């Protein structure tokens, strides 16, 4: 079902005019610029703000090759969304990258019917993950892995001059008393070449 959703997003994007894509991206950049220029983030584990990015109800998908996950991203972190894929944390930057952006994406550390971010503990610094949105695919390299208590969101705010994405889930596995944050930093990337990115192959 999720992979069906991803295929739907992909096909749909191909049918969109490039000038149309670009206008919508500009809306997202502007949105992010307001966040960067400015709070009230709330832990999802106890919407239309991103409409410009939405295609087939999704704002894109996140790929994490080390653990072979490819999961659709939905705007907002309502439990309804977290039951079917990754949620984007409202109040954080939209996941299209850029100077002074920090997008936060979250998923359950396992559900009875879906692995989701179950194996996120196996990602190590230097591993890479990727976000495909309406404008193409961007890459991040993990630079920081952190465990925090549920009431600390300071790590989730924008860092001026920088381009980050944090993958947020609960930990330890089957306990979920804390939050695991796997953060990446933007790196240059162009898809569909002979490039191989695994840390094993690298560098």
């Amino acid at each position: 079902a999720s992979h069906a959703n991803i295929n739907a997003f992909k096909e749909a994007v191909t049918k969109i005019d490039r000038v149309e894509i670009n206008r919508r991206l500009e809306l997202a950049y502007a949105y992010n610029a307001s966040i960067a220029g400015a709070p009230a983030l709330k832990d999802p584990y106890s919407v239309e703000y991103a409409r410009m990015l939405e295609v087939k109800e999704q704002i894109g998908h996140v790929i994490i090759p080390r653990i072979n996950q490819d999961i659709p991203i939905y705007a907002g972190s309502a439990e309804e969304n977290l039951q079917r894929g990754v949620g984007h944390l409202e109040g954080t930057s939209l996941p299209v990258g850029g100077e002074s952006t920090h997008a936060v994406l979250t998923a359950h550390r396992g559900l009875p019917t879906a692995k989701l971010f179950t194996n996120l503990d196996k990602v190590t610094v230097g591993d890479r993950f990727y976000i495909e949105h309406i404008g193409g695919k961007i890459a991040y390299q993990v630079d920081q892995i952190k465990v925090i208590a549920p009431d600390q969101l300071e790590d989730l705010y924008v860092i001026q001059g920088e381009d980050h994405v944090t993958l947020l889930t609960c930990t330890p596995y089957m306990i979920n008393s804390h939050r695991l944050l796997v953060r990446g930093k933007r790196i240059p990337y162009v898809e569909k070449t002979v490039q191989k990115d695994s840390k094993t192959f690298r560098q």
Side-chain angles (χ1 to χ4, degrees):
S2 72
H3 287 159
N5 277 318
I6 291 170
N7 291 334
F9 180 89
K10 288 179 177 173
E11 296 167 0
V13 162
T14 71
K15 297 161 186 175
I16 305 176
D17 285 353
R18 182 62 49 173
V19 307
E20 170 63 1
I21 287 172
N22 286 340
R23 173 189 70 89
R24 296 168 59 163
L25 288 176
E26 286 304 323
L27 293 179
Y29 301 148
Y31 180 93
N32 284 351
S34 300
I35 294 192
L41 301 187
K42 296 190 69 61
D43 168 49
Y45 305 96
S46 189
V47 312
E48 64 195 276
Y49 69 96
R51 205 169 168 264
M52 85 285 292
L53 294 182
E54 298 190 332
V55 178
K56 296 294 181 175
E57 306 181 35
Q58 306 157 76
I59 64 181
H61 55 109
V62 55
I63 306 180
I64 310 165
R66 182 54 170 173
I67 61 173
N68 191 25
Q69 287 296 328
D70 185 7
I71 308 169
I73 304 161
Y74 296 91
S77 54
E79 188 47 59
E80 304 89 71
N81 286 342
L82 303 188
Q83 288 282 313
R84 60 179 178 163
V86 170
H88 173 267
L89 189 62
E90 193 176 357
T92 76
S93 305
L94 298 169
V96 297
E99 174 174 14
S100 302
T101 61
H102 188 187
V104 180
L105 308 172
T106 194
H108 281 293
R109 188 77 183 278
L111 295 180
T113 58
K115 280 172 85 172
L116 295 163
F117 279 3
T118 292
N119 295 316
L120 198 66
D121 58 309
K122 298 187 168 73
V123 181
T124 60
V125 295
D127 284 337
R128 299 177 179 171
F129 60 90
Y130 308 78
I131 294 168
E132 176 161 292
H133 53 67
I134 189 177
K137 189 187 284 187
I138 50 182
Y140 290 81
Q141 178 161 313
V142 177
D143 70 342
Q144 181 185 283
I145 298 172
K146 197 172 187 169
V147 172
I148 60 170
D151 58 340
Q152 302 320 303
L153 300 200
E154 255 191 283
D155 296 295
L156 298 180
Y157 299 110
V158 173
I159 300 177
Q160 296 298 317
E162 304 289 332
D163 184 344
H164 291 288
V165 172
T166 294
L167 314 176
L168 169 72
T169 192
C170 299
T171 196
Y173 183 55
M174 289 167 91
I175 299 304
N176 304 328
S177 46
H178 287 76
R179 305 301 176 258
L180 174 65
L181 288 55
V182 174
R183 184 184 86 183
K185 161 189 279 186
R186 186 80 172 273
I187 62 169
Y189 169 86
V190 166
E191 62 187 318
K192 291 178 48 61
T193 72
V194 292
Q195 185 167 322
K196 285 190 190 173
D197 285 345
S198 78
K199 202 196 302 179
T200 295
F201 177 85
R202 273 188 276 138
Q203 174 77 315

